Amino acid sequence: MIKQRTLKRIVQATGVGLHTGKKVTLTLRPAPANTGVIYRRTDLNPPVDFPADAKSVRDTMLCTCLVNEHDVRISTVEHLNAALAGLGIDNIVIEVNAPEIPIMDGSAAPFVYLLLDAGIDELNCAKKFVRIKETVRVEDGDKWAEFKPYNGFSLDFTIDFNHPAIDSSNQRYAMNFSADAFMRQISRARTFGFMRDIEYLQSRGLCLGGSFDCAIVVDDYRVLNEDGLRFEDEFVRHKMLDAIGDLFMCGHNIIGAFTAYKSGHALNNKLLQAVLAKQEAWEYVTFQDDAELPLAFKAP
Ligand SMILES: C[C@H](O)[C@H](NC(=O)c1ccc(C#CC#Cc2ccc(N)cc2)cc1)C(=O)N=O
Ligand SMILES: C#Cc1ccc(C(=O)N[C@H](C(=O)N=O)[C@@H](C)O)cc1
Ligand SMILES: [Zn+2]
Incomplete structure (x- = not known):
């Protein structure tokens, strides 16, 4: 079991x-x-x-x-x-x-x-586990996020960035979740912010813990961090890190297919609540038999 x-x-x-x-x-x-x-x-x-x-x-x-x-x-x-x-x-x-x-x-x-x-x-x-069994979609303007039936856990994330320091070929990431894949491909991707905004917040006495040691910071044109990026697509990798964290707020791993375009904390959470609210859109499942356990949720 x-x-x-x-x-x-x-x-x-x-x-x-x-x-x-x-x-x-x-x-x-x-x-x-x-x-x-x-x-x-x-x-x-x-x-x-x-x-x-x-x-x-x-x-x-x-x-x-x-x-x-x-x-x-x-x-x-x-x-x-x-x-x-x-x-x-x-x-x-x-x-x-x-x-x-x-x-x-x-x-x-x-x-x-x-x-x-x-x-x-x-x-x-x-x-x-929370097994998806109906397609569920939420929207907010040109942004969207949905879950679909799928015997596993996959995330397909596209971000709409126009910043010179973020190339287009680095505005989408997709993975089949697993403890090993999260640890190696996602866990090290850092959060990021705009330097002028941070300067402002800190001048108002906010974001006082902000430093180069805790974030990728860019100005209008480039990455300011001395060593640059840990990955070429670290921004979108971090967005997927944030998605996994948002979705796990329900306290259960979800068996299904997550796809998001221009999503963020608010939209991810809106999807999560949308799924859980509809009784027939999901169901609990357990694995008395370990061999049944989807590839995605095996021990690290
Ligand atoms: C990505 C998401 O939107 C979001 N990120 C934040 O809200 C966020 C990101 C970065 C920072 C910062 C900073 C800094 C700094 C700094 C200060 C002084 C100096 N000299 C150098 C750098 C704060 C909040 C997030 O990841 N949510 O999970
Ligand atoms: C507190 C606060 C605060 C929150 C958000 C912003 C903001 O939207 N900044 C803009 C920007 O484009 N940032 O990338 C433009 C204005 O630079 C600014 C201040
Ligand atoms: Zn984050």
Whole structure:
């Protein structure tokens, strides 16, 4: 039987918050079956829990955040979340002594090593997948995103960029998901921003953790980062990293075909909620028989 997974041990890491620029300590903890993904703020007293849920997401100007019933927030969860999907973590408590998850290097990679340090513990309870069984499409102007039936997990992402430092042949990425493919082809792709906008935010006391160490920054014409890009198409690879993180907000791996044109956090989440809202568009499935398990969701 394909079992739910959690961490073997508690691990910690430090880093700066994108918003505050202050040092944030991140603590990852094992969690029992069926409890899912829980983000927790321990700076507040008492601590506040934010169960990962599609309905709780808000797409703020910088990255994303979760909210509780009083509109208290925890921000920048999507890159760590993406790593959770990549390494097949189902139940976990994620604590920060701050209002946000540390930005690290702007990618998911640093979270990969952290999770590997924590190890894997299988729990005696079947892992539930969300199997798409009807086509579901959402739109927003000339932007769209859809899920289609497909015995696997694939993502097909096209981004509309006109920036001189981003060539056209690098405005589409497509992959058949897997722990190994995520770790190698996606996890290291960094987030990115426009330098003048960042300068502005920081002059208003925002995005104070922003630096070359946590993002690809371009001006009107070029990449400013000394070493350049980790991939020629790092921008679109990161957009796919963000898609995986957005979709995993439901706490389950989805068996289906994801396609998106000019999509982002808002649209991805709108699709996620659209799928879950229609009862006949999806169903839970488990794998009592391991050989049944789609290629895409095999252990790392
Ligand atoms: C891609 C998505 O839209 C989105 N990215 C952000 O919202 C985002 C991206 C980059 C930054 C930044 C920065 C910086 C800097 C810097 C400051 C000073 C100096 N000297 C050099 C560099 C913030 C937010 C995101 O990835 N969401 O998941
Ligand atoms: C706070 C804030 C804030 C958020 C977004 C923008 C923005 O749209 N900047 C524009 C731009 O084209 N950026 O690439 C143009 C204006 O440069 C500017 C400021
Ligand atoms: Zn991102």
